[PDB]
Amino acid sequence: MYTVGMYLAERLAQIGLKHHFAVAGDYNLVLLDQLLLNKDMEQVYCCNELNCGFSAEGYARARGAAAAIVTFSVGAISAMNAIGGAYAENLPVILISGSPNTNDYGTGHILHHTIGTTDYNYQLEMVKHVTCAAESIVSAEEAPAKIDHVIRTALRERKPAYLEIACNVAGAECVRPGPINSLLRELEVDQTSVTAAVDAAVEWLQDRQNVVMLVGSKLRAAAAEKQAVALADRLGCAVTIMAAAKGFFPEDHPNFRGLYWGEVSSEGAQELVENADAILCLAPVFNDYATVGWNSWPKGDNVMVMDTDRVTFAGQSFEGLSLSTFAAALAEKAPSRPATTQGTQAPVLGIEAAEPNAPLTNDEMTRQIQSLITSDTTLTAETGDSWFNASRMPIPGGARVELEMQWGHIGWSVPSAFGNAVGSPERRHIMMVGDGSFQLTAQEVAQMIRYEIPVIIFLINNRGYVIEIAIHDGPYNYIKNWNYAGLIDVFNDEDGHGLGLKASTGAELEGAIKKALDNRRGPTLIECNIAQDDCTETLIAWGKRVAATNSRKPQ
Amino acid sequence: MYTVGMYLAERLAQIGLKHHFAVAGDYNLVLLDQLLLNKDMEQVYCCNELNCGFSAEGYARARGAAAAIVTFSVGAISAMNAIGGAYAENLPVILISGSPNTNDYGTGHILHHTIGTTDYNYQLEMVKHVTCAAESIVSAEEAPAKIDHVIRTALRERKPAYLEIACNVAGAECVRPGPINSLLRELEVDQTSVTAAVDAAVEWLQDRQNVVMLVGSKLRAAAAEKQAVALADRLGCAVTIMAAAKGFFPEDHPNFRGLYWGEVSSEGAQELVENADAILCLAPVFNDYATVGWNSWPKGDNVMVMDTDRVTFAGQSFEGLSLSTFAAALAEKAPSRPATTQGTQAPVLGIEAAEPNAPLTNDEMTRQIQSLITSDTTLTAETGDSWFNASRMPIPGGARVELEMQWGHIGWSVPSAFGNAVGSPERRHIMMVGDGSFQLTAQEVAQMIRYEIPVIIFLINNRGYVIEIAIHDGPYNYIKNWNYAGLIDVFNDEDGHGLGLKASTGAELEGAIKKALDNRRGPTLIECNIAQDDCTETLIAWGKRVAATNSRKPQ
Amino acid sequence: MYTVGMYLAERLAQIGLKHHFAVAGDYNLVLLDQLLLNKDMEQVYCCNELNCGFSAEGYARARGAAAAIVTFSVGAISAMNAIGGAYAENLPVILISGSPNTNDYGTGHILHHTIGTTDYNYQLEMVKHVTCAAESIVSAEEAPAKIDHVIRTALRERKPAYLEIACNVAGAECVRPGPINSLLRELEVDQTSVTAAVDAAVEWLQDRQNVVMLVGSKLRAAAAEKQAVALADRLGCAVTIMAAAKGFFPEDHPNFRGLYWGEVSSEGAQELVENADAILCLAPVFNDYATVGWNSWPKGDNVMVMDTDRVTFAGQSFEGLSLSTFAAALAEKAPSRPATTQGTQAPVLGIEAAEPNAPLTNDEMTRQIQSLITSDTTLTAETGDSWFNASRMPIPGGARVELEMQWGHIGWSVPSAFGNAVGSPERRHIMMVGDGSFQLTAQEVAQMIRYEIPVIIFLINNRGYVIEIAIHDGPYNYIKNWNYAGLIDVFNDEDGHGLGLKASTGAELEGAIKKALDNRRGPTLIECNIAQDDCTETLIAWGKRVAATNSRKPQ
Ligand SMILES: Cc1ncc(C[n+]2csc(CCOP(=O)(O)OP(=O)(O)O)c2C)c(N)n1
Ligand SMILES: Cc1ncc(C[n+]2csc(CCOP(=O)(O)OP(=O)(O)O)c2C)c(N)n1
Ligand SMILES: Cc1ncc(C[n+]2csc(CCOP(=O)(O)OP(=O)(O)O)c2C)c(N)n1
Ligand SMILES: [Mg+2]
Ligand SMILES: [Mg+2]
Ligand SMILES: [Mg+2]
């Protein structure tokens, strides 16, 4: 007996998934059983569906795709928040939901876990707004076409997708999937467009001596990181990153000149980019946060925007190509433009160590975290002042930084780091999460414990929502303090090997970090006591610009 | 300076809210400031937006309405789950989201907390599927009409509604709201219909000696609890409840004859209902869980269905009336029909006290919890075996029992008990939650601690999803155990006055209950060690019927 | 045998429908049979579903409600345009669609008249955007509730609504509807609010001497025509209408002072409104066309806006009332304010009779049409220069003018007049329609002929889209000329009593009108030869303002 659920599981295995995330409910139990029969995947359980969804999202940052299985409505609607986040962050997460028995359609039956009307279609209609494809299976006959359609579309678009499978069809006899080379099939490229684009680009660079590359947060989605390097080596020009693009270009590189983020840029990088004769933007996302409230937005005659399927410059826009293909072809023909590398250098941390027994500062915490980042390290940085600490940390080549600056859902980091570490266990896994963020999703630390995932968690306990205080202060920014370190042994109970530690000084942090490195059978949470008043100066400047922009009057 | 947010606050206070629930975010901060200016309300903060929504939902069970305020997308989509919950359970919860600055509409700008496209309307489009009204405010001029339409429709339909307010409109100058008697305005009743319905009902009851009232879960939504009592008193007939209707009819009543729930009914009640010549159903919801998988569903010649706005019986349907006005009018003219009360008795708990040092049983735990329920007690019972324990407990008249049997989102109980206790602090608040459920929403116990809410939480630690085991067993039912009692110390830190206790015997439970009653400055969690095998026999019988119905094969 | 379709037919009869409109399709044939069994209604067939929908719309203008019955998708989507129009113009039209057999739900079957996917819900999801209620019926048991919900909501909201009925459920056995007084039940009014609103309104009028009523296009939707007269009688002030409100206030009232429409107002009416101390706006719609491109929009301190459910003035807004109840209560307490009636005059047509043999002018045509308008005449005026001719015609009390100025769908007038004449056959029915408009819907004249409906059609053959030429000229405004008068013979064939006549002079028009008045057994089309450049001066002035407003550059 080969079933619909096995077809799904076999295709998920062919994507490269070694795991999928689940929360059981009576609409998906038979489905979950079919997925357990597949030998190439482990079925990982989560506390709640918001966390399950974000676990899949993190797994997708490790493996290029992921799958989250939930129950109808009560499960799926919370997961839709994580799916919207996958869409925002350009990740192929597949959300599969159990759905009502086929015999209930066209009857007028009221069903459990619904709003209590005869419409069972509302979940599909809701989820279409946060997915690139969305299908519902009510027969075994139609399942192959729909399963494959959602997976193929997700992988090609780099966007999440949705399936629902009727609870009484997940175990129904289904045809077997045929063999494949890859489930990712790109669109065929138009060589006329690439050629005309390259030649136009070469002509445009002729009278432009000061050239800067600006790397954007869609570069990984374009699968063009290597072609970005190739291009950079032939131009020999300065390379900068947008905040959300950290780790998508090696900061090791001899021509790297730091972070462009308007008035909160690395030293020199603002005037570098803003005075350049040619700015080559590689897959940028110029949203209100990245532009510091619409103040720092490169555009005009001096800008070339290289999106994932398009390049635009000099009054022209060339389409039917990929960033991968255009960057590779332009690399062949690009002239030397080294001027912007001369009389500049890669930015440094600029934090000399603190007196080891003094109260722990933000700079000092940032310094020790930075020293932990190897070339086999993944650092997950939460929305909060962690964006601004992570943004000023130099990293070695091969190191991966995970940011969620488009969606910006606080608490993302805990289940994301869990999913990421499950998907790339060979790497060292670090995360920086604020106290506020941590409270939304804290319970997934228990699943890190259950599955023995050695994430090192730097909890910044600054007694509130500090980034919100820098935008607009009020009573809503002040939260109930927990003993975050002591939470670990509650989640351990009898079995677990999590470790909960405290650090109120440089010397205490140093010692906690040693014990964290040695703890291999579970996570280690280092509660860092940082003063509420002790945040980055970059956060305070950005926050003021964001507050002004959000509050600007109507017309 | 009178503002849009102030207009909203004033109307919310006019509904009778003394609290509203919020999670801050930059899209709603200015709105939160305006709501804070209102003298008649306190602003209660939550850990996450899912919990914030269920806290409002619990508050609405106490006060008849509630408000949750969230930020765009990252907040709102989680809260949509709880709003779907509010729809399912017929509760006027208003969800208010902060939304984008008016100046970004029609520009093409990409905004933080969005999926990254130019569509800002997608949240409104999603939330329409789980609300009775949903509006978007982008000007102070239109705000009054949209605020009032949302609030009025919610209250009248007994369904949740949605508002989004542009972050730069919340503090814009607005006209003042006029004085009101009540924002609940009902539809005019059609007396021609009432009269004909009553006259037809009297004629239908002429040759029907065995009459039984079956009280349903929409009776509170109909605002017809008193009229139900008047009708029972006049008929003098037997009165039963459906599982979801507990506390909507007084179990004190001399003519009460227990729970009707198919094969898992109280003693006698199945035979009583199913053999009656007339069954008067008052506001039923005959879903798949309530009918035990379509096996126990009263319909046909012997059945009268009284919906909130309609009566159906004897091949006729009468509308333009309300359950309240029809029940009253029928009580005036109803014949005496006492035959079903003669010789029978109201059902008894029937649990003998255990030996005080024997390992704690489900029965013994149920016995001690049942003794805590007074006429001023609210018992919130979670989806789990707590549904079946709660449904076999007799309660005194005036006792309130909260079940979420249509939506059935595990974890609902914790934030719902929180909001309900905040809304009715004069009452004693008891909570029955399973270990599995507790893990989804655990963190809101920290808000009970923050706001000093003396909920007594009976945590049933049976080491997994036991109700899911009764449907279909597999590895997905077994969760990571926590030290649930010890979690209270973590949430307390230095501030709090919550108490965490364990009970493994009848005597240990007794002492923990006594310390629970004496703790007025915070919640008391009592972790009860119940065996995984030791669940009610009703759960097992009901579980098998549900599995067989859910799994029935396609056509 | 009492069926679902009979329940529907009986509820439609109870609203006051003596007709419903249909286009047969295999999905609705059985439903159409059920409807035909109803003794109180005739079933009227239309050429196409756009026309069917607009025929219902016109019927609703006569009788307050209407019904159009169509087939799935191929029928319903065209009808949605008319439904959109009904929403725009505040008319309770019920669109009923046949839909798929219930056994196809949850199967994956591909069905005829669909887009060819397994989704059959897409029609319902589309129509929700242009309706106040939308329900799908897949069982006889649920049919009564859904039928009554859509009808009651439509009548109370004064908006259209949607039903779909499965093609195998329309003939299914149903319970019978109970007797009613009226299917229109209003919301109970809040006396506290009315009292405060009237008392603040009186106080506000006490301090303001020059008062002017401005009658708006939602006054009929408010059902407040008579209360408006009472208010005008107690106030004794000048009364003006907005263009779309023509006929909603009697123009031979001694205090009527004409049309307010910015710079295209009738003589003296612009100054009268714009220099007033108080402007009482009774149910206005201030769209871009009504305000002459936002140049003439009364607002601010001298303005009181009475909506259908709200009153707003002097920094306050009162709700929980109706325009009907509020204006009646204000009519008993308001002060006398006659100053704006003194000196001024009710405006006249001001067109001298042309020399009878001179080429027909726009003025001469307008003069002769104005003469036909009696107290029991209904004039349907199409989008085009007819808007501007109708708006400069004085009409006696009781006369009705139908304009579609919110939706503005050219061609609406032909099927609208047809439905209106079917619904109000005791009246004289006149139509003004342009050549361009007529071409979209000309075939419904054949239905006028079929059903012997004596509409007098004045077809203005100005050879193109003259209103669009005044906005912005180009080749898209010039259309193929037809022999419009000769079309009547084609539709007559050997059977009908339509008359088609040409008028190129005042004498020929006079002769044609006399023949039109004598033709009782069918419509009379009078094709009037009007020069392309002979359009009203008001159209030119208005056209320029609209063009400038639409083209205004982005920011
Ligand atoms: C789900 C969600 N809710 C609310 C917000 C709004 N928000 C953004 S940053 C922030 C504060 C984060 O606090 P913390 O985690 O303590 O970081 P800190 O700024 O203190 O370092 C909030 C409440 C959000 N982005 N996502
Ligand atoms: C959000 C959500 N996810 C999943 C489910 C499916 N579900 C129903 S009962 C249940 C088990 C609850 O277990 P517990 O709280 O331990 O109570 P017990 O049955 O053990 O008494 C689950 C996972 C649900 N109802 N809601
Ligand atoms: C369905 C539809 N299509 C197009 C338009 C745009 N439009 C508005 S007025 C008009 C011209 C109408 O021409 P005619 O009926 O001859 O009247 P005239 O302007 O000549 O008086 C057009 C095409 C519309 N309102 N509705
Ligand atoms: Mg913080
Ligand atoms: Mg359990
Ligand atoms: Mg024309």
Tab-separated table of C-alpha atoms in Angstrom, chain B residues 248-416:
chain	number	residue	atom	x	y	z
B	248	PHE	CA	-26.212	28.117	31.357
B	249	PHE	CA	-29.047	26.414	33.261
B	250	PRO	CA	-28.957	25.991	37.078
B	251	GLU	CA	-28.079	22.388	38.059
B	252	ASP	CA	-29.722	23.239	41.455
B	253	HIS	CA	-33.120	23.297	39.698
B	254	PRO	CA	-35.490	20.578	40.993
B	255	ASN	CA	-36.397	19.509	37.421
B	256	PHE	CA	-32.743	19.277	36.151
B	257	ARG	CA	-31.938	15.732	34.918
B	258	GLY	CA	-28.307	16.056	33.781
B	259	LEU	CA	-26.051	16.018	30.725
B	260	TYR	CA	-27.240	14.777	27.305
B	261	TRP	CA	-24.192	13.804	25.204
B	262	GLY	CA	-25.096	10.578	23.421
B	263	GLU	CA	-23.477	7.477	24.921
B	264	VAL	CA	-21.422	9.640	27.341
B	265	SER	CA	-24.528	11.224	28.948
B	266	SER	CA	-25.329	11.340	32.698
B	267	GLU	CA	-27.286	8.386	34.099
B	268	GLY	CA	-30.825	8.316	32.637
B	269	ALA	CA	-30.346	11.394	30.417
B	270	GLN	CA	-29.836	9.533	27.110
B	271	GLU	CA	-33.052	7.528	27.579
B	272	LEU	CA	-34.887	10.684	28.749
B	273	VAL	CA	-34.048	12.785	25.664
B	274	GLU	CA	-34.152	10.055	22.994
B	275	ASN	CA	-37.578	8.673	24.077
B	276	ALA	CA	-39.328	12.043	24.560
B	277	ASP	CA	-42.443	12.898	22.501
B	278	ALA	CA	-41.168	16.508	22.463
B	279	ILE	CA	-37.585	17.776	22.659
B	280	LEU	CA	-37.260	21.560	23.030
B	281	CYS	CA	-33.711	22.459	21.954
B	282	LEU	CA	-32.694	25.924	23.169
B	283	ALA	CA	-29.896	27.384	21.018
B	284	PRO	CA	-28.060	24.137	20.148
B	285	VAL	CA	-24.871	23.672	18.142
B	286	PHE	CA	-24.981	20.126	16.791
B	287	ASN	CA	-21.346	19.788	15.672
B	288	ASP	CA	-19.404	16.509	15.161
B	289	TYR	CA	-17.967	16.546	18.732
B	290	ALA	CA	-21.336	17.384	20.382
B	291	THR	CA	-23.144	14.588	18.472
B	292	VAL	CA	-20.428	11.963	19.181
B	293	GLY	CA	-19.604	11.672	15.446
B	294	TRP	CA	-23.180	12.090	14.149
B	295	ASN	CA	-24.560	9.183	16.293
B	296	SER	CA	-26.549	11.286	18.791
B	297	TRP	CA	-28.286	14.145	16.947
B	298	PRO	CA	-31.949	14.800	17.854
B	299	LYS	CA	-34.029	15.830	14.791
B	300	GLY	CA	-37.377	15.139	13.056
B	301	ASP	CA	-41.045	15.238	14.158
B	302	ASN	CA	-40.360	15.210	17.947
B	303	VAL	CA	-37.878	18.115	17.922
B	304	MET	CA	-38.259	21.867	18.249
B	305	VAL	CA	-35.122	23.879	17.440
B	306	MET	CA	-35.053	27.320	19.059
B	307	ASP	CA	-32.191	29.262	17.461
B	308	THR	CA	-31.248	32.799	18.579
B	309	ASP	CA	-33.554	34.329	15.926
B	310	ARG	CA	-35.893	31.545	14.735
B	311	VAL	CA	-38.045	28.591	15.806
B	312	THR	CA	-38.506	25.453	13.760
B	313	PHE	CA	-40.896	22.559	14.411
B	314	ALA	CA	-43.891	20.747	12.847
B	315	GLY	CA	-42.780	21.470	9.247
B	316	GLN	CA	-42.714	25.238	9.888
B	317	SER	CA	-40.170	27.950	10.644
B	318	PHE	CA	-40.875	31.295	12.354
B	319	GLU	CA	-38.336	34.135	12.214
B	320	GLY	CA	-38.250	37.842	13.028
B	321	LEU	CA	-38.250	36.923	16.714
B	322	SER	CA	-35.648	36.116	19.351
B	323	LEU	CA	-35.139	33.134	21.637
B	324	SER	CA	-35.742	35.456	24.606
B	325	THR	CA	-39.090	36.830	23.328
B	326	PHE	CA	-40.364	33.452	22.038
B	327	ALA	CA	-39.431	31.583	25.251
B	328	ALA	CA	-41.166	34.217	27.429
B	329	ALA	CA	-44.242	34.276	25.188
B	330	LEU	CA	-44.378	30.467	25.151
B	331	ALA	CA	-44.018	30.374	28.972
B	332	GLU	CA	-47.195	32.510	29.161
B	333	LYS	CA	-49.314	29.944	27.194
B	334	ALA	CA	-47.475	26.602	27.707
B	335	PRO	CA	-49.384	23.585	29.085
B	336	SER	CA	-48.236	21.815	32.256
B	337	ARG	CA	-46.107	18.844	31.173
B	338	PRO	CA	-44.605	17.371	34.387
B	339	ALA	CA	-44.417	13.635	33.417
B	340	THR	CA	-40.649	13.602	32.757
B	341	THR	CA	-39.801	14.835	36.307
B	342	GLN	CA	-41.780	12.151	38.198
B	343	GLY	CA	-39.651	9.381	39.772
B	344	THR	CA	-36.252	10.627	38.470
B	345	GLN	CA	-33.425	12.603	40.163
B	346	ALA	CA	-30.688	15.121	39.265
B	347	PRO	CA	-27.377	13.275	38.688
B	348	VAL	CA	-24.920	12.919	41.606
B	349	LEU	CA	-21.077	13.131	41.480
B	350	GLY	CA	-20.831	9.655	43.044
B	351	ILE	CA	-17.090	9.633	43.788
B	352	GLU	CA	-16.137	8.136	47.159
B	353	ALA	CA	-13.168	9.757	48.916
B	354	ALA	CA	-9.893	7.886	48.388
B	355	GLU	CA	-7.422	6.762	51.052
B	356	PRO	CA	-5.488	10.037	51.720
B	357	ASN	CA	-1.947	8.630	51.053
B	358	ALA	CA	-2.719	6.439	47.995
B	359	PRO	CA	-1.343	7.681	44.613
B	360	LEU	CA	-3.601	10.424	43.228
B	361	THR	CA	-6.397	9.263	40.932
B	362	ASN	CA	-8.374	11.155	38.325
B	363	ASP	CA	-11.551	10.541	40.397
B	364	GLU	CA	-9.955	11.822	43.619
B	365	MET	CA	-8.635	14.961	41.900
B	366	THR	CA	-12.083	15.501	40.332
B	367	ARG	CA	-13.692	15.102	43.790
B	368	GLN	CA	-11.569	17.818	45.427
B	369	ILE	CA	-11.918	20.276	42.532
B	370	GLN	CA	-15.712	19.788	42.557
B	371	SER	CA	-15.812	20.768	46.294
B	372	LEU	CA	-14.192	24.123	45.439
B	373	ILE	CA	-17.012	25.200	43.100
B	374	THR	CA	-19.293	27.700	44.893
B	375	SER	CA	-22.106	29.900	43.576
B	376	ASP	CA	-19.460	32.662	43.022
B	377	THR	CA	-16.971	30.359	41.193
B	378	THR	CA	-15.836	30.401	37.554
B	379	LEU	CA	-14.346	27.087	36.355
B	380	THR	CA	-12.367	27.289	33.072
B	381	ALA	CA	-11.889	23.741	31.649
B	382	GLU	CA	-9.376	23.062	28.867
B	383	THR	CA	-9.761	20.803	25.809
B	384	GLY	CA	-8.392	17.481	27.054
B	385	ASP	CA	-9.690	15.010	29.638
B	386	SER	CA	-10.665	18.165	31.626
B	387	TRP	CA	-13.738	18.377	29.294
B	388	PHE	CA	-14.892	14.994	30.593
B	389	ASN	CA	-14.025	15.641	34.267
B	390	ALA	CA	-15.803	19.011	34.222
B	391	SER	CA	-18.852	17.529	32.438
B	392	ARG	CA	-19.460	14.983	35.281
B	393	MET	CA	-19.189	17.553	38.134
B	394	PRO	CA	-22.480	18.829	39.584
B	395	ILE	CA	-22.288	22.601	40.154
B	396	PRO	CA	-24.328	24.955	42.386
B	397	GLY	CA	-26.617	27.606	40.855
B	398	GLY	CA	-24.705	30.766	39.911
B	399	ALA	CA	-21.518	28.754	39.193
B	400	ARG	CA	-19.997	29.575	35.804
B	401	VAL	CA	-18.187	26.948	33.683
B	402	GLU	CA	-16.169	27.984	30.609
B	403	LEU	CA	-15.631	25.446	27.833
B	404	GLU	CA	-14.298	26.101	24.321
B	405	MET	CA	-15.862	23.150	22.562
B	406	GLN	CA	-16.400	24.603	19.047
B	407	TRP	CA	-12.911	26.089	18.491
B	408	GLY	CA	-11.045	23.707	20.824
B	409	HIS	CA	-7.611	25.387	20.716
B	410	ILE	CA	-5.416	23.713	23.352
B	411	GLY	CA	-3.771	26.368	25.528
B	412	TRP	CA	-6.856	28.651	25.354
B	413	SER	CA	-7.559	28.069	29.074
B	414	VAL	CA	-4.510	29.859	30.509
B	415	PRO	CA	-4.882	33.306	28.889
B	416	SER	CA	-8.724	32.901	28.929
